[PDB]
Design a protein around this ligand. Structure first.
Ligand SMILES: Nc1ncnc2c1ncn2[C@@H]1O[C@H](CNS(=O)(=O)NC(=O)CCCC[C@@H]2SC[C@@H]3NC(=O)N[C@@H]32)[C@@H](O)[C@H]1O
Length: 265
């Protein structure tokens, strides 16, 4: 109840003023009070012929959020930054589209990293889509492919309490950021995201380099829970040029395109 006082609404006009115009690649930005899924919404626009490249959709509340692999995403009003953007990807080799998702998490991380007084342990990126802080899930990323576009979705916990959404979640407020400004964070996030998308489109090596620098997974003992229910235990060593996780399994290399990572002691 007290957190409500820490959840003023977004300022759509201000965001537009900042993010659309010379020097910026964003073409459209809308804030909606409520929707089922911002990712579904942008996919639907594309499916009816809309050019969603550089289109931004932000929702104050999201009632039927989607996670990876048919899972859900929970939210309460004004507690998160919940957005999707459209990205034209057909100009880029299909084998590289996996990196777009990794780039998105990096952008989210960089957009909020400096708000924390001192970064707790286990703060960075968990492959393939998690921004972690103090071991808690601060943000989740969902990339959905609908050539010629990919729709990139971000759910970032700003003041969202774990008790409201998920026991393994955290938020900026729960990390000690007393009065996070969603307007400022949203603007920084989208600016970081534009830069990373440009880097990705041009195969800039700095993208992979910066991702590696923030990886909590690389070098860690991991259990990876594969689509279909199988588990593989090993040590994460690298991310390949397709954005796939490379594991060391007793001296053998196992490359995973999708899975849920658990960092082990
Ligand atoms: N708020 C939360 N914070 C942290 N963890 C959560 C939350 N809610 C659920 N979980 C857990 O996280 C698991 C899911 N983890 S995944 O790794 O499978 N999937 C994700 O994290 C992608 C989330 C994308 C959400 C963005 S938003 C705007 C856009 N439009 C959409 O509809 N989607 C995107 C769930 O099973 C829960 O256990």
């Amino acid at each position: 109840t007290d957190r409500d006082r820490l959840r003023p609404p977004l300022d759509e006009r201000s965001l537009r003023d900042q993010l659309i115009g010379a020097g910026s690649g964003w073409r459209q930005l809308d804030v909606v009070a409520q929707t089922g899924s911002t990712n579904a919404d942008l996919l639907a626009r594309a499916a009816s012929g809309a050019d969603i490249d550089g289109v931004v959709l932000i929702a104050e509340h999201q009632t039927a959020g989607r996670g990876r692999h048919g899972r859900g995403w929970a939210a309460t009003a004004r507690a998160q930054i919940i957005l999707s953007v459209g990205v034209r990807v057909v100009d880029v080799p299909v084998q590289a589209w996996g990196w777009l998702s990794l780039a998105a998490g990096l952008a989210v991380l960089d957009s909020v990293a400096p708000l924390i007084a001192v970064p707790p342990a286990e703060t960075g990126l968990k492959w393939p889509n998690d921004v972690l802080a103090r071991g808690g899930k601060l943000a989740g990323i969902l990339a959905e492919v609908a050539q010629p576009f990919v729709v990139l979705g971000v759910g970032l916990n700003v003041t969202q309490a774990p008790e409201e959404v998920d026991p393994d979640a955290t938020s900026l407020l729960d990390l000690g950021v007393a009065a996070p400004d969603r307007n400022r964070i949203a603007s920084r996030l989208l600016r970081e995201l534009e830069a990373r998308i440009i880097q990705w489109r041009n195969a800039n090596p700095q993208l992979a380099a910066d991702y590696r620098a923030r990886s909590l997974t690389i070098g860690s003992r991991v259990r990876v829970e594969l689509p279909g229910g199988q588990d593989v235990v090993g040590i994460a060593r690298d991310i390949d040029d397709q954005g796939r996780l490379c594991l060391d399994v007793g001296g053998r290399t196992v490359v995973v395109s999708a899975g849920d990572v658990v960092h082990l002691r």
